[PDB]
Amino acid sequence: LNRGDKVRIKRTESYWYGDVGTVASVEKSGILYPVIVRFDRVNYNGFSGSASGVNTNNFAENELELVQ
Amino acid sequence: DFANLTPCSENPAYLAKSKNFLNTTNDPNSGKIRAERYASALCGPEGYPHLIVDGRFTHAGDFLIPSILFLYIAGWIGWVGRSYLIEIRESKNPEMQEVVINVPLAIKKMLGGFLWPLAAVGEYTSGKLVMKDSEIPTSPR
Amino acid sequence: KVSVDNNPVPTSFEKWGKPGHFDRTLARGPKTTTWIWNLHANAHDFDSQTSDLEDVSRKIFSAHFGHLAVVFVWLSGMYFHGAKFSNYEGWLADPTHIKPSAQVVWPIVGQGILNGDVGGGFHGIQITSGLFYLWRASGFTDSYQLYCTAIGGLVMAALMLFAGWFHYHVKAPKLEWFQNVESMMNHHLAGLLGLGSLGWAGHQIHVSMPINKLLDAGVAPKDIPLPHEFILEPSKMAELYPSFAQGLTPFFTLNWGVYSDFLTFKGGLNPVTGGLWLSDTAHHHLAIAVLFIIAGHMYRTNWGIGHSMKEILEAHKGPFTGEGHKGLYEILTTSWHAQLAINLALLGSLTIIVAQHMYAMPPYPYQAIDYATQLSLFTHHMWIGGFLIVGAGAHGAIFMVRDYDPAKNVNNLLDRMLRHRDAIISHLNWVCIFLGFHSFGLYIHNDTMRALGRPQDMFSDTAIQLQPIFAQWVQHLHTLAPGATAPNALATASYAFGGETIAVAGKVAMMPITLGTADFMVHHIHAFTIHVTALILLKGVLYARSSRLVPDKANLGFRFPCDGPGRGGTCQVSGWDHVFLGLFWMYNSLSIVIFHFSWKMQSDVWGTVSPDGSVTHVTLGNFAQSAITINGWLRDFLWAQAANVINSYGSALSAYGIMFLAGHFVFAFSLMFLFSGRGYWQELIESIVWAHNKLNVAPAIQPRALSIIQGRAVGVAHYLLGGIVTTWAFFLARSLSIG
Amino acid sequence: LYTHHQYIAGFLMVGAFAHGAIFFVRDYDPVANKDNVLARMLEHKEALISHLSWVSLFLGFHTLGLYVHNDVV
Amino acid sequence: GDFLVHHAIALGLHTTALILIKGALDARGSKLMPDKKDFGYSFPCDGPGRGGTCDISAWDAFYLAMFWMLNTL
Amino acid sequence: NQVVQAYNGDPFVGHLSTPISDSAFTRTFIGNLPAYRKGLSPILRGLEV
Amino acid sequence: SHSVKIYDTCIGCTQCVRACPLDVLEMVPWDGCKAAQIASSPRTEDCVGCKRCETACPTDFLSIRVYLGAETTRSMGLAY
Amino acid sequence: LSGQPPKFGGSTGGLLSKANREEKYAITWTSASEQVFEMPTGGAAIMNEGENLLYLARKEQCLALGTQLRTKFKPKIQDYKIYRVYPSGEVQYLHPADGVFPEKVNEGREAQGTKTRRIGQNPEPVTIKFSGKAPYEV
Amino acid sequence: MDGLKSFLSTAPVMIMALLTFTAGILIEFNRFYPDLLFH
Ligand code: CLA
Ligand code: CLA
Ligand code: CLA
Ligand SMILES: CC1=C(C/C=C(\C)CCC[C@H](C)CCC[C@H](C)CCCC(C)C)C(=O)c2ccccc2C1=O
Ligand code: SF4
Ligand code: SF4
Ligand code: SF4
C-alpha cells in the first residue's frame, strides 16, 4: 500500500465498511494499525448535534483491499 | 357481474344528489358538467361514484390511466434527481452543491427527463442503474 | 451620549450565497444533514457567533428593526383587508345583525363554500379578531381611511427596513450607547408610552369621541362628518360637547372641572354599544400619559437631576439578603438574556392581564355583542402570554449558563438565590403536590362519589361546600366601591363583580359572575398548574448551572441532551429540557384556563335576554353542577360543545372541522418524536441509505437523523401546534354557532 | 370476545418478535449457523428492512391521502 | 369503506412488523453501534456520543412496536 | 446584623441557620418535642407523640 | 462498578482521559502506536457511566468502551 | 487534612447525611492570591491565601472544582489534592494518585482495563452461555 | 450580482419556487377543468 491508493474496508466494525477511501499514509514503525485511510464520508462521531464526525481512521494492512 | 353497483344514469339516489351538486369554480355550470361527467361511472346505493381497480379496460380510466400518468411524471422526478446527484459527485465539492443548486445543470437535467424509461432500460442493461452488493457500504451482518 | 461607528460592515450580497457564515462550526461546509438544523438553530444566537457585547448589540438593534418591519407589514395587511376585502362599509351601518368578514376565499376546489353568508350580501369568512370593533372605536368610517392606514403602514415598514440597514451597515451605535439604560427608560416612559398615550388621548378627544357619539346617536356612516371636520370647525364639537366652547384656557388655569362633560370618570359600560365609554377611555389615556411622562423624568441623564438606577439598587440591603442588590446593575446592563428574561416575563403577564381585562371590561363597541370576538381574544392573549412566560424561564436558564459569572456578584441576591435552590425547589414541590392532591383530588372525589350514587358526599354547592369566601368578599367590596371607596365613580368598574345584567341587542354584554364551589375548585386547578409550570421553569433557571447530579452543566452548555446513561441516566438535565417540559405544562395550564373561561361565559354570562327581563344562557347553567366532576367536563363541555365543530361539514364552518381534525393529527404525529429516540431512527435511516446506495442515488450530504434536542423540539412544537389548532377550531366553531 | 382475542393476538405476535430479537442477541451462534437461512436473514437485513420501509410508507401515504382527500371534499 | 380500513390495517401490520424486525435483525448491531450483543437486550442507550443514541436497543424497538400494535388493534 | 449564618458554624453542611430552622425559639421548641426532648425513655415520648 | 475497557485501536490522543469527569482513566506507556501511549482505567470503581470518554474517542469504531453494570454508591453519583 | 476552609456563607447544596455515615471528599489546593470561585454546590466563595480545605459529598464535585481551578484561573492552581475521608477517620488519597495528572504519561503506571483485541474480536454471548460471565470480561 | 444568483439558487428558495410552480399549475388545472375524479 502507498499514498493516494483507494482501498476497500473489511473491518466489519467501521462506519466505512465496504466503502472506498484514499490512503493518506503508511507507517513503518511496527505499530498494529499503521495505514491512515481517509474517506469522503464522515462517520458517527462527536456529541449530539455536532454538524460532522471524523473522516479518518487507522487500519491495518490486512483489513484493506486495494481497488486501484 | 357487479350487480351491487348500478350505473349512475339509472340510479334513483344519484339523481336525487345530482339535482343539487354545488359549484366548485366561479362557473355556474360546474355542477351540471360534473353531474354529466359522473353519470358514466358506477355508483352504489349511496349515490357516490365508485372506482374499479381490477385493470379491466372497460374501467381503465378509473385507475390505470392515472397510474401510467403518475408513473411517468414521477419517474421523471426520480430520474432527474438521480442524474443530477450522480453528476455533482465529480465536482470536488459534492456536498455544497446540494445546498446551492447548480441551476444551469439542474435545468438541463430536468429537461432530460423526457426519455427516462429509455434511460432506465439503458442504464439497467449497461449496469449503471444498480450497484453490486459488495461495492456499497453496509452494516455489520 | 451618541457615539457611532461609521460603515462597520459593507452591504454586499456575497455572504447571502454562503449559508452558515455566522457560526464558525458551519463555515466549513455541510458534511451531514445536521448542518441544516444547526444553520437554523444558531441563526439568531447572536451571543454565540461572537462575544464582543457591542456587535451583538448592533445585531440585536437591526434585528429589532427588521421585526418591526414584519409587524408593520402584518398590520398593513390587516388594514388593507379591512379596506378592500371586507364588509366594514356595510357592517358599520348595521352592527347588530350582520357580522364582520375581512377575508373572501377564491373558489378553486369547492372552497367557495367557506364564503358563508355573513350578512348584507357580502360572502366571506367571518373574522373573530376584533378588528372591526377596533376601527369603530378608533373612529374609522370609510374604507379609504383604512386604505390610507394600510399604505402608511407599508411605508413605515419600508422605513423600518431602511433603519435596520442604516443601523447595522452605515452608522452603528457603540456599546456605551446601549448601556445608557437610564436615558433609554426616560425616553421609553416619557416619549414612547407617555407621548403615545397622550397622542391617543388627543385622538380620542378629537376623533373617537365625536364619531362614536354621533354613531351612538343613530346617524348613518355616510352622514358622519370626516374626523378633520371636527377640528377645522370646533363649533361642531361645541354642538356635541358643550365644554369645547371654552377652549384650552380652562386647562391651562386648572379649571379642569368644566371638562367633566367629556373627561368623566364614569365607569361601567355604555348601554347602547356594550363597550366602555370613550369618555373615561380618553380620560384614562390622559391620566396614563401624565403619569408616564412624570415617571419618565426619574432616571439620571446628562443633567445632574435624576435618580440613578445603580444607587437605587445598591441602597436596598436587608438582614436576610446580606449584600443586597449591589451587583445586579452589572447583570442587566451586560447581558441581553437577563433583559430578555425579565421583559418576556412581564410581557407575558401583561398579555394575560390584557386577556383578563378585555372580557370583563370590553373596551370596544359591540365587542360583547358577539362571543366569537370575546372568546377568541381571551384565548389568543392567554396563549401568547403563556408562551412568553415560558420564554422568560428559557432565557433565565440561558443567562445562568452563559452570561452569569459569579466573580462579579458574591453574596448578592442572585448568589443567595443559587445557595438555597434545594429549599426553593423543595417547597415548590410541596405546594405543587399539595395543590394537585387538593384540586384534582377533589375532582376525582366528586367523580367517584357521583359514580357511586352518593351525590350528598360530593363537593357540590348542594353538598359539602367549598365557597371561595375571599373572592366573594372582594366581589362584595367592588360592588360596594362606587359609593364609598370610589365616590366619583358613577357605576361599577365592571359588571363582572356585580350590578346589572347589561343586555344590548338582545344579547348579554356583561352580567355578574358568581363564584360557587365550582369556581373554587377550578381556580385551585389554575393555581396548581401555574405552580407546576413555575416549578419546571424555576428549576431550570436555578439548576441550569449545576446540580448534585451533573455538577458541570455550565460548560456542557444550555442545549445539551444529557450527560450520559450514567448515574442511572441523566437524560434531561439541561435547562433547555426544562423549557421543553414547561411548554407542555404551559399548554396544560392555559388550556384549562380557556376551558374555564369558555364554559363559565357560556353557562353563566353569555346568552339572550328576553324583553320580559329573563336571561337564558348558552349552556343553561351547566357550570354549577357539572364543572365539579371530570365526567361533567368531558360530557357537558368537550362532547356537548363539539357538536358544532363536527357536524359543520358541508357548510361555511367546515374549515373549522377540517382544522379540528388536523390538530388531532398533528398531536398524534408529535407523539412520534416525543416517544421515540434518535437511535432507532438512525439505524432505520441506515437501511434506507443502503437502498439508495444499491442504485447509486445516495446523497453527498449524509442524512443524519434529527439530534436529541431536535427530536424533543419538533415533538413539543407539533404537540403544541396540534393542541392549539384543535382548541382554536373548537372555540371558533362553537362561537360562530352561538351568535 | 373478538376484541379480547385480537388484543391477545397482537400481544403474542409482538412477543414472538421480541423473543426473536432476544434469540438474536443471546442464543444466536453465527458460526454454527453459517450460510443457512438465519445467516442469510442477517446477511441482507438492510434490503428487507428498506422494503418494509417502502411498503409502509407507500401504503400509509396513500391511505392518509385518500382519507384526507375524502374528508376535505 | 372497508377497502380503506383494510389498507390502514395492512399499514399497521407492516409498520409494526417493520419495527419488530428492525429490532430483531439489528439486535446484533448496526453502524451506529456495531456491538449491541455485548450490552444485551435492554440497555438504555449508548451515550450522547455518535450523534445521540437514545432508543438503540432492540428492547426499544419492542417499545415502539408496542405502540404500533396498540394502534393497529 | 446577618440572620442567616451556616448551620452550627459549619459552612459546608447542606443547611442554613435561618430564623426558622435554627432560631432560639425553634431550638427550645423543636428540641423539646417528645421526639427530641432530652432524657426521656422512648416509651413516654412515644406515648406523648 | 462499570468496566472501562480500552482496545488496541487506541491512538494515544489523550482525549478520553481529559474528557472523563472523575478521572478514572490515565495514560500509560505503550509500544503499539505513534503516540507511544494507551489509555488505561485504573480507578474504574469510580466510573459513573457518563460515557464522555466514548464521546471523545476519535478512532472508529471505538477504542474505549464503558460496560454499565453493578451500581454502587460511587457509580450512581448519589450525594445522599 | 491541613488548611483553613474557604470563606463561604453556607448553602443548602452540600453535605447530606451521606457525609457522616459513609465517605465524603476533601479537595485541598494552595493559591497565593485571594479570589472568587464557583462552588459546584452552588454559589461563590473566597479562596484563602495559602492552603484551602473544601469538604464535598461526591468525587465528581471535587473533580469539577479542580477542573475549574485549572482552567478558569490565569495563575493556574495545579497542586490540588483530592482526598476521600471516612467518618471512622482514615483519609484516602485519590485524584493525583501518582505524581502527575492522568493525561500525562508517568511511565511507571500499569495498563489495566486494556483488552488485547478490538471490539470486532470480542466474544459473542452464545459461546458463554450460563457461565456467569458477560462477553466483555471473557 | 452572483450573490443574489447564489441566494436564489439555494435549496429553500428553489424548492419554494418549485412548489409554487407546481401549486400554480395544479390550481390552474383545477380552475379550468374543475372536477376530474377519473378519465
Ligand atoms: C431524487 C432523489 C431520490 C430518488 C431517485 C430516490 C429513490 C428512492 N427512494 Mg427516496 N428519498 C429522497 C430522494 C430520492 N429517493 C429524499 C430527498 C428523501 C428524504 C425524505 C428520501 C427518503 C426515502 C425513504 C425514507 C425511502 C426512500 C425509498 C426510495 C426508493 C423507492 C422510491 C420511493 O419510495 O420514493 C419515496 C420518496 C420520498 C418519500 C421522498 C421523495 C422526495 C422528492 C419528491 C424526491 C426528489 C428530491 C429532490 C427534490 C430531487 C432533486 C432534483 C434535482 C433537479 C436537483 C428509491 C430507491 C424507499 C426505500 O427504501 O426503497 C426500498 C424508502 O423507504 N426514499
Ligand atoms: C422576545 C422574544 C424572544 C427573543 C427574540 C428570543 C431570542 C432567541 N431565543 Mg427564544 N424564546 C422565546 C422568545 C424569544 N426568544 C420564547 C417565547 C420561548 C419559549 C418557547 C423561547 C425559548 C427559547 C429556547 C428554548 C431557545 C431560545 C433561543 C433563542 C436564541 C436563538 C433563536 C434561534 O436561533 O431560533 C431560530 C428560529 C427558529 C428555530 C424557529 C422555530 C420554529 C417555531 C418554534 C415553530 C413554528 C412556529 C410557527 C408559529 C408555526 C407555524 C409554522 C408552520 C405551521 C407553517 C435567541 C437569543 C435558543 C438559545 O439561545 O439557546 C442557545 C434556545 O435554545 N428560545
Ligand atoms: C393525567 C396525567 C398525569 C398525571 C396524573 C400527572 C401527575 C403529576 N405530575 Mg405530571 N406530566 C404529565 C401527565 C401527568 N402528570 C405529562 C403528560 C407530562 C408532560 C411531559 C408531565 C410532566 C410532569 C413534570 C415535568 C412534572 C410533573 C409533576 C407531576 C406531579 C404533580 C403533583 C400532583 O399533582 O400531585 C399528585 C396528584 C396526582 C397524581 C393526581 C391526583 C390523583 C389522586 C388524588 C391520587 C390517587 C388516589 C390514591 C392514592 C390511589 C391509591 C390506590 C391504591 C390501590 C394504591 C404529579 C405526580 C411535577 C412534580 O413532580 O411536582 C412535584 C413535575 O415537576 N409532571
Ligand atoms: C421520525 C424521527 C426522526 C427522523 C426524522 C427525520 C429524518 C426528519 C425528516 C424531515 C423531513 C425531510 C421533512 C422536513 C420538514 C418539512 C418540510 C416540514 C413540512 C411542514 C409543512 C406542512 C409546514 C428523528 O430523527 C428523531 C430523532 C430523535 C427523536 C425522534 C425522532 C423521530 O421521531
Ligand atoms: S443518549 Fe438519550 S437515552 Fe441516553 S442518556 Fe442521553 S438522553 Fe438518555
Ligand atoms: S480517546 Fe480513544 S483513541 Fe484517544 S487515547 Fe482515549 S482510548 Fe485512545
Ligand atoms: S464513563 Fe465517564 S466516568 Fe467512566 S471512565 Fe468514561 S468518562 Fe470517565
Numbering used by the authors:
A (entry chain E): 3 to 70
B (entry chain F): 3 to 143
C (entry chain A): 13 to 751
D (entry chain B): 369 to 441
E (entry chain B): 516 to 588
F (entry chain L): 5 to 53
G (entry chain C): 2 to 81
H (entry chain D): 4 to 141
Study text:
Photochemical conversion occurs in two photosystems, photosystem I and photosystem II (PSI and PSII respectively), which are multi-subunit protein-pigment complexes located in thylakoid membranes. The cyanobacterial PSI is composed of a highly conserved core containing 11 subunits that coordinate 94–96 chlorophylls (Chls) and 22 carotenoids (Cars) per PSI monomer. One of the conserved features of PSI is the existence of a small number of “red” or low-energy Chls, defined as Chls with an absorption maximum at longer wavelengths than P7005–9.
Here we produced a chimeric PSI in cyanobacteria, introducing a small loop which adds a single Chl (B33) to the PSI complex of Synechocystis, reconstituting the B31-B32-B33 Chl trimer from T. elongatus in the Synechocystis PSI. We demonstrate that this additional Chl forms a new red state in Synechocystis PSI (named C710), contributed to by the B31-B32-B33 trimer. We can also confidently model the loop coordinating this Chl and the conformation closely follows that of the T. elongatus PSI structure. We conclude that the added B33 Chl adopts the same configuration as in the T. elongatus PSI structure with its dipole configuration parallel to B32, which is, in turn parallel to B31. The closest distances between the Chls rings π systems over the trimer is ~3.7 Å, all of these factors contribute to the stronger electronic coupling between them leading to the red-shifted C710 state. Altogether, we observe no additional structural changes between Red_a and the WT PSI, strongly supporting our claim that the addition of B33 is the underlying cause for all of the observed spectroscopic differences. We can clearly resolve the 96 Chls (in Red_a), 22 Car, and 9 lipid molecules present in both models. We solved the structure of the chimeric complex using single particle Cryo-EM and measured a new type of large-scale heterogeneity in the PSI trimer, suggesting that each individual PSI monomer can occupy a range of positions in the PSI trimer.
